[PDB]
Structures are given as structure tokens and as C-alpha cells.
Amino acid sequence: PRNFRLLEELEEGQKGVGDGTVSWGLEDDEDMTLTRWTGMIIGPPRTIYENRIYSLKIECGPKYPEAPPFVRFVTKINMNGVNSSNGVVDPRAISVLAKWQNSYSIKVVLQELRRLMMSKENMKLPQPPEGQCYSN
Amino acid sequence: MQIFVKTLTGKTITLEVEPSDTIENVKAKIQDKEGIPPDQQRLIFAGKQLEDGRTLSDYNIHWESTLLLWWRL
Amino acid sequence: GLPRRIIKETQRLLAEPVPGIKAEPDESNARYFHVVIDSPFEGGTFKLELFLPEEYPMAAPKVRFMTKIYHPNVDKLGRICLDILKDKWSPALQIRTVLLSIQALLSAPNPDDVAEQWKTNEAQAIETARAWTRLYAMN
């Protein structure tokens, strides 16, 4: 059931579950549909992304967690699968979204996005100045 | 109350605080206990980077709530 | 399939509805239950979702309020702050007891959050509660 899972994911985001390298939570604490979330990732060591903070907006639809959610970066980033114009994530480019399972969650998507920042293609790639945000 | 602070590596530490103290003061409690200076402290909570101006009450922070401490390299 | 205890409880909720409470399982998910339930909350219908985790009956049911209510024991997201479901749950209780306990809270709002102003200013605050039950629970 969509609502109750998002309630568990909310409490997990408040308890900071995981290896401390990603965080997620509601965009609006009064949103009773639990649709719009905000995520954050810190770059992984040994990469050009390392120690750069990246914010993301995540949208869980009515069929979540049956279907994957929409994901886009708000902080500028150059990475395969992320639209260079608005930071939208192409689900076909991310295996965790291309082959989505209802066991996955927002935490998993963030963890997958951070792991992929270590891939060969993304490891070394020119980054825009830190802290920039797409025009929205 | 008591709050947690998890770091990039995975270490989690407990800290005593009040629901009415400001993050600026909360950033100091983490200093006196861990030595990290408020300059290179970036505290995250549930997908939100905390701003030194606001207070914990504004972020609906309760007991057992875990903060994520990210530092600047 | 599904455990026998759940089947037995479902047949009792079907063959013996509780007074003033409609509770039915979703056709797709049997553990998911759609729930509809003097006091300023008289007249407005309140929808509710109830779920039974795999640990049930060991773990307590998950119940929240889909409808928005002005109540000290309900936060902005509708999760029910009752002890029966928090840490006072025992396998002896059943869905029947949870539902009955929830409707009891509706009858006796206990201020023992907004409760700071809902208990102190019992007249100015309750003026807003009666309205919410008409604005957000029209039909």
C-alpha cells in the first residue's frame, strides 16, 4: 500500500538509515498525499564529485511503489543519465529505475545514483561550479 | 532530549539538546563533543541542509531524530 | 494464500459490522483495509486506511487518517497517535479492538503539538475543529 510505505520511508529518513551518504524527506511536511520528496547526496571519495552536495527532487506517483518514481537533480551535475539542461534522470540510463522492483525505495535510488557516480564514465567528467542550481 | 549524528563514514554519536535551542547552538554542542568546528559543519536532516538561522522546533526535530554531519574537504 | 487468523477476522468484520464503522478489504490486497468512520466530528465522514504487516498478529496494525482532522492525537499527516498501536499492542487484540479504540478517541479527545493551544484555549481552538470536519470531510 503506497501510503503506508511512504510513511515508513519518511520515518527512515528522519532516523538517517544507511551509511550516512544520502538523505531524503518530504518536500512539505503538511503534504498528506506524500507525493513530493527531497533527496540529497554527497559525492563519493576518489571522484570529481567527492564532497560536493547534490540536492534532488523526487516524485512518487499514485502507483508507487509499483512503478518507479520521477527523479531530477536541482544542483547542476554532469553525469550519464542526467539531462544536462534540467537535471532530469532518464530511467532507462539507471538500472535501478530501468528494472524497478517494488522492494526498492527512495533510499535505494539515492544509493544507486551515488554508486553510479563512481562508474568509469562519471568518475572523471567536467563539473559545473559547485552549488549551482538549474533554472526552475 | 537526545539526538544522533551520523557521519559520511558511518559513525553515529549521541548528543543532548533542547527543542528550543538554535542550530547555531546545536552546531556548538557537536563541537564541544567532537571538535569539528561550526565552519566546516554541514548538518543534514531528512533531505534538508539546516540553516544556522532557524531552530530545531522549525524542523520538527524530536527525540531519537538522527542528523547527518557532512564536512567540507 | 493468507494466514487463517486473518481469514477468520475478515469473516467476522464482514458478518458483524461494528456500529458506525465501515471496514472492507481491497479487492487487490487482502491485508489492505478501507475504513470509514455530540462531538464536533458529528456528520463528517472520515476515511481511513488499515494495513496488516507480515508480522501480524505480533506487530500492531498500521492505521492512519486519509481525511484531515483537527485533533490533538493526529498530526499533519494523519498518523494516529494512540498507545494501543504504539507500544501497548498485544497479539490478543484484533482489528476489531483497534477500530473501536480509534472511534473512542473521536468521542474523548485527550489533551494529556497543537494540543498546547487546544487544551489551554479550549473555546477558540475547538471553533476551528468543528469547521475542518465540514471543509475537508464534505462527502
From Swiss-Prot, chain A:
Looking at the record, the residues that make up the UBC core domain are: 1-136
**So which domain of life are we looking at?**
Eukaryota
Induction remarks: Down-regulated during differentiation of cultured colon adenocarcinoma cells.
Q: Which GO terms describe its cellular component?
A: cytoplasm; cytosol; extracellular exosome; nucleoplasm; nucleus; protein-containing complex; UBC13-MMS2 complex; ubiquitin conjugating enzyme complex
Q: Which Gene3D superfamilies match?
A: Ubiquitin Conjugating Enzyme
Q: What is its main location?
A: nucleus
Any Gene Ontology biological process: positive regulation of DNA-templated transcription
* GO molecular-function terms, A-Z: ubiquitin conjugating enzyme activity; ubiquitin conjugating enzyme binding
- Family matches, as SUPFAM superfamilies: UBC-like
Compartment(s) of residence: Nucleus
Which positions form S-S bridges?
A: none
Tissue expression remark:
Highly expressed in thyroid, pancreas, spinal cord, lymph node, trachea, adrenal gland, bone marrow and pancreas. Detected at low levels in heart, breast, placenta, brain, liver, kidney, stomach and lung.
Which UniProt keyword terms apply here? Acetylation, Nucleus, Ubl conjugation pathway
**Which PANTHER family does its entry note?**
UBIQUITIN-CONJUGATING ENZYME E2
Q: What does this protein do?
A: Has no ubiquitin ligase activity on its own. This type of poly-ubiquitination activates IKK and does not seem to involve protein degradation by the proteasome. Plays a role in the activation of NF-kappa-B mediated by IL1B, TNF, TRAF6 and TRAF2. Mediates transcriptional activation of target genes. Plays a role in the control of progress through the cell cycle and differentiation.
* UniProt subunit comment: Heterodimer with UBE2N. Interacts (UBE2V2-UBE2N heterodimer) with the E3 ligase STUB1 (via the U-box domain); the complex has a specific 'Lys-63'-linked polyubiquitination activity. Interacts with TRAF6.
State the remark under miscellaneous.
In human, PESD1/KUA and UBE2V1/UEV1 are adjacent genes which can produce independent proteins and can also be fused to form a PESD1-UBE2V1 hybrid protein.
What is the protein named?
Answer: Ubiquitin-conjugating enzyme E2 variant 1
Q: Identify the taxonomic lineage of the organism of origin.
A: Eukaryota, Metazoa, Chordata, Craniata, Vertebrata
Tell me the name of the encoding gene: UBE2V1
From Swiss-Prot, chain C:
Domain (UBC core): residue spans on this chain = 1-138
Q: Which domain of life is it from?
A: Eukaryota
- Summary of activators and inhibitors of this protein: Activity is inhibited by binding to OTUB1, which prevents 'Lys-63'-linked polyubiquitination. Activity is inhibited by GPS2, leading to prevent 'Lys-63'-linked polyubiquitination.
Residues modified as N6-acetyllysine = 76
Give the pathway: Protein modification; protein ubiquitination
Q: What organism does the record attribute this protein to?
A: Homo sapiens
GO terms for MF: ATP binding; RNA binding; ubiquitin binding; ubiquitin conjugating enzyme activity; ubiquitin protein ligase binding; ubiquitin-protein transferase activator activity; ubiquitin-protein transferase activity
Q: What is this protein called?
A: Ubiquitin-conjugating enzyme E2 N
- PTM entry text: Conjugation to ISG15 impairs formation of the thioester bond with ubiquitin but not interaction with UBE2V2.
Quote the cellular component terms of the Gene Ontology held in the record: cytoplasm; cytosol; extracellular exosome; nucleoplasm; nucleus; protein-containing complex; UBC13-MMS2 complex; ubiquitin conjugating enzyme complex
Gene that encodes it: UBE2N
Q: What class of enzyme is it?
A: transferase
- List localization entries: Nucleus; Cytoplasm
The positions flagged as active site in the entry are 81
- Purpose: The UBE2V1-UBE2N and UBE2V2-UBE2N heterodimers catalyze the synthesis of non-canonical 'Lys-63'-linked polyubiquitin chains. This type of polyubiquitination does not lead to protein degradation by the proteasome. Mediates transcriptional activation of target genes. Plays a role in the control of progress through the cell cycle and differentiation. Plays a role in the error-free DNA repair pathway and contributes to the survival of cells after DNA damage.
